[PDB]
Write an enzyme that holds these catalytic residues in place. Structure first.
Site, PDB file in Angstrom:
ATOM      1  N   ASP A  78       0.838  -1.195   0.000  1.00  0.00           N
ATOM      2  CA  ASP A  78       0.000   0.000   0.000  1.00  0.00           C
ATOM      3  C   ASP A  78       0.880   1.254   0.000  1.00  0.00           C
ATOM      4  O   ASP A  78       2.097   1.198   0.179  1.00  0.00           O
ATOM      5  CB  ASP A  78      -0.949   0.004   1.205  1.00  0.00           C
ATOM      6  CG  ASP A  78      -2.171   0.907   1.008  1.00  0.00           C
ATOM      7  OD1 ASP A  78      -2.366   1.437  -0.108  1.00  0.00           O
ATOM      8  OD2 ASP A  78      -2.944   1.067   1.978  1.00  0.00           O
ATOM      9  N   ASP A 249      -7.212  -8.129   0.387  1.00  0.00           N
ATOM     10  CA  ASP A 249      -6.127  -8.153   1.371  1.00  0.00           C
ATOM     11  C   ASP A 249      -6.728  -8.551   2.679  1.00  0.00           C
ATOM     12  O   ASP A 249      -7.841  -8.127   2.978  1.00  0.00           O
ATOM     13  CB  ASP A 249      -5.404  -6.813   1.509  1.00  0.00           C
ATOM     14  CG  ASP A 249      -6.294  -5.700   1.976  1.00  0.00           C
ATOM     15  OD1 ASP A 249      -6.811  -5.764   3.112  1.00  0.00           O
ATOM     16  OD2 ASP A 249      -6.454  -4.726   1.233  1.00  0.00           O
ATOM     17  N   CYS A 286     -11.397 -28.926   6.217  1.00  0.00           N
ATOM     18  CA  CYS A 286     -10.163 -28.226   5.908  1.00  0.00           C
ATOM     19  C   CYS A 286      -9.025 -29.203   5.674  1.00  0.00           C
ATOM     20  O   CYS A 286      -8.814 -30.132   6.457  1.00  0.00           O
ATOM     21  CB  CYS A 286      -9.813 -27.309   7.077  1.00  0.00           C
ATOM     22  SG  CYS A 286      -8.317 -26.335   6.806  1.00  0.00           S
ATOM     23  N   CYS A 288      -5.849 -28.314   5.725  1.00  0.00           N
ATOM     24  CA  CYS A 288      -4.590 -27.752   6.203  1.00  0.00           C
ATOM     25  C   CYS A 288      -3.880 -28.720   7.147  1.00  0.00           C
ATOM     26  O   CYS A 288      -4.465 -29.665   7.682  1.00  0.00           O
ATOM     27  CB  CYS A 288      -4.801 -26.381   6.847  1.00  0.00           C
ATOM     28  SG  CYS A 288      -5.074 -26.351   8.671  1.00  0.00           S
ATOM     29  N   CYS A 291      -5.347 -29.144  10.693  1.00  0.00           N
ATOM     30  CA  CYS A 291      -6.556 -29.953  10.773  1.00  0.00           C
ATOM     31  C   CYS A 291      -6.278 -31.409  10.459  1.00  0.00           C
ATOM     32  O   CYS A 291      -7.035 -32.280  10.896  1.00  0.00           O
ATOM     33  CB  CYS A 291      -7.651 -29.374   9.876  1.00  0.00           C
ATOM     34  SG  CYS A 291      -8.245 -27.751  10.449  1.00  0.00           S
ATOM     35  N   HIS A 317      -4.021 -22.259  10.190  1.00  0.00           N
ATOM     36  CA  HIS A 317      -5.314 -22.759   9.752  1.00  0.00           C
ATOM     37  C   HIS A 317      -6.119 -21.658   9.068  1.00  0.00           C
ATOM     38  O   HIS A 317      -6.729 -21.886   8.021  1.00  0.00           O
ATOM     39  CB  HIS A 317      -6.119 -23.340  10.908  1.00  0.00           C
ATOM     40  CG  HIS A 317      -7.564 -23.437  10.579  1.00  0.00           C
ATOM     41  ND1 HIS A 317      -8.079 -24.438   9.784  1.00  0.00           N
ATOM     42  CD2 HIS A 317      -8.579 -22.581  10.820  1.00  0.00           C
ATOM     43  CE1 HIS A 317      -9.371 -24.219   9.605  1.00  0.00           C
ATOM     44  NE2 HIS A 317      -9.695 -23.100  10.226  1.00  0.00           N
TER      45      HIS A 317
HETATM   46  C1  LIG Z   1      -9.648  -1.981   7.002  1.00  0.00           C
HETATM   47  N1  LIG Z   1     -10.288  -1.134   6.011  1.00  0.00           N
HETATM   48  C2  LIG Z   1      -9.629  -0.534   5.023  1.00  0.00           C
HETATM   49  N2  LIG Z   1      -8.292  -0.643   4.840  1.00  0.00           N
HETATM   50  C3  LIG Z   1      -7.958   0.141   3.751  1.00  0.00           C
HETATM   51  C4  LIG Z   1      -6.736   0.475   3.152  1.00  0.00           C
HETATM   52  C5  LIG Z   1      -5.467  -0.145   3.703  1.00  0.00           C
HETATM   53  C6  LIG Z   1      -5.087  -1.482   3.020  1.00  0.00           C
HETATM   54  C7  LIG Z   1      -3.961  -2.202   3.726  1.00  0.00           C
HETATM   55  C8  LIG Z   1      -2.812  -1.526   4.116  1.00  0.00           C
HETATM   56  C9  LIG Z   1      -1.786  -2.187   4.767  1.00  0.00           C
HETATM   57  C10 LIG Z   1      -1.879  -3.547   5.038  1.00  0.00           C
HETATM   58  C11 LIG Z   1      -0.747  -4.288   5.662  1.00  0.00           C
HETATM   59  F1  LIG Z   1      -1.162  -5.204   6.548  1.00  0.00           F
HETATM   60  F2  LIG Z   1      -0.012  -4.929   4.757  1.00  0.00           F
HETATM   61  F3  LIG Z   1       0.080  -3.495   6.306  1.00  0.00           F
HETATM   62  C12 LIG Z   1      -3.030  -4.220   4.656  1.00  0.00           C
HETATM   63  C13 LIG Z   1      -4.052  -3.559   4.007  1.00  0.00           C
HETATM   64  C14 LIG Z   1      -6.760   1.425   2.122  1.00  0.00           C
HETATM   65  N3  LIG Z   1      -5.581   1.862   1.540  1.00  0.00           N
HETATM   66  C15 LIG Z   1      -5.575   2.918   0.669  1.00  0.00           C
HETATM   67  N4  LIG Z   1      -4.398   3.289   0.162  1.00  0.00           N
HETATM   68  N5  LIG Z   1      -6.681   3.573   0.316  1.00  0.00           N
HETATM   69  C16 LIG Z   1      -7.920   3.184   0.790  1.00  0.00           C
HETATM   70  O1  LIG Z   1      -8.940   3.804   0.467  1.00  0.00           O
HETATM   71  C17 LIG Z   1      -7.965   2.045   1.732  1.00  0.00           C
HETATM   72  C18 LIG Z   1      -9.178   1.652   2.301  1.00  0.00           C
HETATM   73  C19 LIG Z   1      -9.162   0.702   3.322  1.00  0.00           C
HETATM   74  N6  LIG Z   1     -10.209   0.251   4.130  1.00  0.00           N
HETATM   75 ZN   LIG Z   2      -7.374 -26.264   8.947  1.00  0.00          ZN
END
Ligand SMILES: CNc1nc2c(CCc3ccc(C(F)(F)F)cc3)c3[nH]c(N)nc(=O)c3cc2[nH]1
Ligand SMILES: [Zn+2]
Ligand SMILES: CNc1nc2c(CCc3ccc(C(F)(F)F)cc3)c3[nH]c(N)nc(=O)c3cc2[nH]1
Ligand SMILES: [Zn+2]
Lengths: 351, 351
Positions: A78, A249, A286, A288, A291, A317
């Site tokens: 990100d 993600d 599952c 995995c 399990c 898991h």
């Molecule tokens: C939880 N809700 C949410 N997360 C959001 C994220 C974060 C995505 C992210 C960042 C880092 C990691 C890590 F675990 F790898 F660190 C995992 C996932 C967004 N990111 C951007 N740029 N714009 C958005 O509009 C947006 C909307 C989002 N709603």
């Molecule tokens: Zn499992």
């Protein structure tokens, strides 16, 4: 040798698609779940954390994130602003970027992601808070589109990055159809390798999220991948795939450290006493390795005893469950039975 | 089919021995390290913990500890009193046993270990506190010898246990040669399958521990295994093997959760900033899977970030290091170069 980036759709059912993204470091089967790497065809790096510890320049000195983590396949990062705005103690926003307790701008975000060496780079955007008024959502989305152009230009200026990585643009516009359309139009005019739906999973709830996806995903180019950021629970994934999302993600890793296991019959809290004598595996179907070998009773025992092993087995898991979910989604779309799978999944998951 | 219990010595160098214990569930190569199971040829169960959660009768209902843990090879259990006296909030000792906040007696300890289904059962003893006066050490040791006879009789009364498990007696006597001799004589008159040196690793320090081992181990039957309880660091193990010990039991698991890795150049604290850019594996010679794949820098990063994965990688490495240590000990004794190995080990470990 594989191309820098090529998305192909192998099969469709309604708005759902299944296919592959080919990149230099590997093939990504879609719909895809992308787990955190420090917990799959692609993993997520944590830009916000890495830029602070050890720092992006230090990661580059150590050979990049692939070498650092021992993962030679694709990595998505990100752009860092979502996490700055969520976690940082003090922030100051301007047209240049965000200052926080550091300045993160589109140019610096792209450079950080270059130093980390990720394969899928996100544009630097603003995730508009929810709820937002139409005026605030519009002003925010407009700034994000200006930042998307700056992100594009910064990425294209770095030969190693432009030739070997891919850049995704992020749609904003809160819950408003007209702003989502303007955002999609702006992103398509700039041109990106893939398109994310941003600004969701920020407190709006599933019904509203699905309503926004209903009109928002069709606005994005059909021939490019669609990434719903921040989502989510297994039922969110199924419904988002039904609405044309290809990539997802964190919950499986967070849940695994807090006693929660995912099963086809819904989540369970393994610390509850009802599992102390339960000889069944975490999930009855599952495949995995957890399990295959251990009971709910033993995992319950380990977690209740404070043993790190218990949380790690839960996490293994949960990650495997998510990947089995994605495989069942891909197979059912390819076989023309995804609508039925979604119905059967929901009936059992919520029973 | 293997016998219930058979110890054979394949090679000797000084007081050091290497050989095998054959039991129904597997062969144990000696000298042996026996790690905790919830973290090898044999693992340790945690009698004290299990008798409280979920309880011994519940473990038996679930099929015994082998089924519960998914481990089909030998398991050793302690008799529980050491841990009661160390960890319990209130205790009341009598000739019958120990009451604590439950009564644990020789008979109940043996029955608990039977319900757990362990293969090597420890007699129920009293680990005399250190320092102890001669009078107190003698009275304590005498009670332990009466309890050793009661342990023997209780074990022999349970057919399934007597026919399939083995019983070890525990020598006491604090640091006093005459009491250690009386204890060894009493244990040999009762008769056990193996003999433990108890009452050490309780604050006396390595020099004093080795001095006590110098006279105590030769008092035990030569043709039976010798188990030093509670020991220990890698250098304690090497020195105890030089003094005739065959079996050792926690530090590698505790260390792994607190940032400490064992290496042939001594322990390191991986959280220290000096490891943040160190691309070498935890140990330069270690064949474990962690050292095959990841750097000190990445493990440092994970632990500093609070990731459970970091502690688990550290623990896996530490357990594997201990097993490589034991393999090098067995090989060097069998080859007649253990004295040289011990010298080289110390010079490097303490450099
Ligand atoms: C939880 N809700 C949410 N997360 C959001 C994220 C974060 C995505 C992210 C960042 C880092 C990691 C890590 F675990 F790898 F660190 C995992 C996932 C967004 N990111 C951007 N740029 N714009 C958005 O509009 C947006 C909307 C989002 N709603
Ligand atoms: Zn499992
Ligand atoms: C640390 N020092 C020490 N530990 C000692 C122990 C405990 C052995 C044990 C128990 C449970 C576990 C578990 F991790 F598996 F739970 C691991 C090891 C002794 N035990 C008895 N019975 N008599 C002794 O005289 C004695 C002396 C001991 N000095
Ligand atoms: Zn190692």
């Amino acid at each position: 040798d594989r191309p820098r980036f090529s998305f192909s759709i192998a099969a469709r059912e309604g708005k759902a698609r299944t296919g592959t993204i080919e990149m230099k470091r590997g093939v990504i089967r879609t719909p895809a779940f992308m787990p955190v790497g420090t917990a799959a065809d692609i993993i997520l790096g944590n830009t916000y954390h890495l830029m602070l510890r050890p720092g992006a320049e230090r990661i580059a000195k150590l050979g990049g994130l692939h070498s650092f983590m021992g993962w030679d396949r694709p990595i998505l990062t990100d752009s860092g602003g979502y996490q700055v705005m969520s976690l940082s103690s003090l922030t100051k926003q301007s047209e240049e970027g965000v200052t926080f307790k550091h300045m993160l701008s589109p140019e610096r975000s792209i450079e950080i992601q270059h130093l980390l060496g990720s394969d899928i780079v996100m544009a630097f955007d603003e995730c508009t808070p929810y709820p937002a008024t139409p005026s605030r959502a519009a002003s925010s989305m407009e700034r994000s589109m200006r930042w998307a152009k700056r992100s594009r230009d910064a990425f294209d200026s770095r030969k190693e990055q432009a030739e070997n990585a891919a850049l995704f643009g992020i749609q904003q516009g809160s819950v408003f159809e007209n702003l989502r359309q303007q955002s999609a139009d702006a992103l398509a005019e700039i041109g990106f390798d893939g398109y994310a739906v941003g600004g969701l999973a920020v407190g709006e709830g599933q019904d509203e999220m699905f309503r926004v996806l209903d009109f928002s995903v069709p606005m994005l180019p059909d021939d490019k991948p669609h990434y719903l950021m921040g989502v989510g629970k297994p039922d969110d994934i199924v419904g988002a795939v039904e609405r044309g999302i290809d990539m997802f993600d964190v919950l499986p890793t967070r849940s695994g450290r807090n006693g929660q296991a995912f099963t086809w019959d819904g989540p369970i809290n393994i610390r509850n006493a009802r599992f102390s004598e339960d000889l069944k595996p975490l999930d009855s179907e599952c495949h995995c390795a957890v399990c295959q070998k251990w009971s709910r009773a033993y995992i319950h025992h380990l977690i209740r005893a404070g043993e790190i092993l218990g949380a790690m087995l839960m996490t293994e898991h949960n990650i495997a469950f998510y990947q089995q979910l994605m495989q069942k989604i891909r197979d059912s779309i390819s076989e023309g039975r995804f609508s039925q799978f979604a119905q059967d999944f929901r009936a059992r998951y919520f029973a």
